[PDB]
Every structure is written in C-alpha cells, then in structure tokens.
Symmetry: C2
Subunit: 47 residues, 2 copies
C-alpha cells in the first residue's frame, strides 16, 4: 500500500529471502547425494 | 504518498483546519465592526 516506485521489490525481497520451493529442491538433492556416491563407488569397484 | 482512498481528505483537513484567508477576512470584518456601530449610532442620533 504505497506509491513509491521500488517499494514492492524491496519489501518482497525482505519478506521472502529464499522461496520455500528452492530450499526444498536443494534439500532433496543434497539428501539423495550419499546414495549416488555409494552407487558410483560400487560401479567403480567392478570393472 | 499512499494508495488508500480518503487519506488525502483526512490529512488535508488535519493539516489546515481553517484556511488563512478566511481567518483574515473574519478578522478584518470584526475589527471594522465598532466603526460601523459608531457610524450608525451617529446617524440614529440625528433624525
């Protein structure tokens, strides 16, 4: 509720520094990483 | 600097309850009143 240009951008950036969806995507990939490491180690161990 | 309807009216009314010009007009007429009273009393005293 204002007429000042640029207030919307600043206030939105302050309210939500990082969107929830991106945080959850990062969490999912990071949590799945160790299984990938184990799988590639197993593949390396053979041939 | 706002988008709220009616904020301009309220804020202007609070800033300037009475305009200067109207106060000065009232002052001029009120200050001139006693001379009018004296003149009309003089007119009445004759005829």
């Amino acid at each position: 509720n204002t007429l000042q240009p640029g207030c919307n951008q600043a206030c939105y950036d302050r309210a939500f520094p990082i969107s929830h969806i991106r945080y959850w995507v990062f969490q999912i990939i990071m949590v799945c990483t160790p299984s990938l490491c184990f799988i590639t180690y197993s593949v390396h161990q053979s041939a």
